[model samples]
Target chain A: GNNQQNYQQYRQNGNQQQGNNRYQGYQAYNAQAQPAGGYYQNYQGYSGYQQGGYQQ
Target chain B: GNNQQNYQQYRQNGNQQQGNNRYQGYQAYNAQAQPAGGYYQNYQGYSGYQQGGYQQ
Candidate 1:
């Protein structure tokens, strides 16, 4: 309720040209709001032992 | 072509149990792969001037 009202008020304020312009900047910033992007790799089950009949 | 092939290879290698185990980690890492996230704000058109009926 309060949150929605606040958002509504915020948008209403944005209706004014000066406010709207600044809001556009905020919108652009939020568009790519993620910290960054990249890739990752890993390995698994690589114990120092081999299964099966076992060998000396 | 190359990228697709590489992904397929990665996935294929992942099918084998040992290889597959590590691939799950890589998959997990890629899942939340965005840089980060946040918000922004700005101001606009508020120069030191007023139209016709302006005053100093």
Candidate 2:
């Protein structure tokens, strides 16, 4: 599992994006709608929205 | 106690969708992003996914 909650944390210095994950930034850009992405979102108390490819 | 429902099911798979988790694949996709750190990210077609810790 990734150890970075803030997408910026990954992009800030470590983890880099690739392929489908490239939009990860855009996803993080609109995080205000939800909390976190992937399983963490549902785990964080956001079980009222939809699923993936939402950032773009 | 926020802008979402309080689903307490501890056996959530990856499928977690919006209103209904039907994305077992995506769940496995981002499975790498788990409670290993802070809150994970949030995408669009995501809401039904299983949530994580800090319930206390």
Candidate 3:
């Protein structure tokens, strides 16, 4: 039961992170702005994170 | 995607809280030498593990 819950959480987290990144990319692309340097810096910044640690 | 990650965090937190509450309750029940007043107080003290939003 414990292992089941943990594995489920792990998969859920991985997929969620991937989806978040994808959406972030999509929004940036839609804006048609190629400010890679500042954008990357802002994207990786820690302020937007939730209570638990993000992949970073 | 942001919504998905937020939901995942919410679910994970709920599961974790449920698990901890069950464990805490079991411990309380097993210690058959229950002191009605003091035991309740001690058991209730564990509310600290819960989020700040829980207690009134």
Candidate 4:
């Protein structure tokens, strides 16, 4: 209980900053959505992420 | 400016749920810390993360 709670709190704290950056990257990764295949890929390449999305 | 602002807003929105899950996972991954050389590593294997840390 103690350790879990501590870790949970730590996550909440870290998310305040790390989460913001990751969130920004996630959206940028999905900026371009291909309609025909319903695939969203980022061509600009946000450094940390790569081309990804549904294939179907 | 317009695009950037829009992306920022999108990030803010997507983070509401994704951030929470990612943050929780990050904490669970960091629960284990190796004391050999201060190089805390998550041996549980977080699927995405790998062996990483400073050399100091």
lDDT tens digits by residue: candidate 4, A1-56? 11111111212222233343232222212222112212222233112221243221
Q: Write the per-residue lDDT of candidate 2 for residues B1-56, one digit (tens) a residue.
A: 12232222223223312232232323222123223325655555443432332221
lDDT of each model, Cα atoms only? 0.21, 0.29, 0.20, 0.24
* Model 4 misplaced regions, further than 4 Å: A1-23, A26-46, A49-56, B1-15, B18-56
lDDT of 1 by residue, A1-53 (tens): 01110011111112222221111111111121222223333223321222223
TM-score of each: 0.16, 0.15, 0.13, 0.16
Q: Which stretches of candidate 3 lie over 4 Å from their true place?
A: A1-26, A34-44, A49-56, B1-56
Q: Pick the candidate with the highest DockQ.
A: 2
Interface RMSD values, listed in order for every candidate = 31.2, 19.0, 24.1, 21.3
Candidate 2, B11: how far from true, in Å?
25
The prediction achieving the highest lDDT against the true structure is 2
Please, what are the lDDT tens digits per residue for candidate 1 over residues B1-56?
11111111112112122221111111111121123322232323222212234232
Candidate 2 docks at the CAPRI level of: incorrect
Local error of candidate 4 at residue A27 (angstroms) = 1.8
Cα lDDT of model 1 overall?
Answer: 0.21
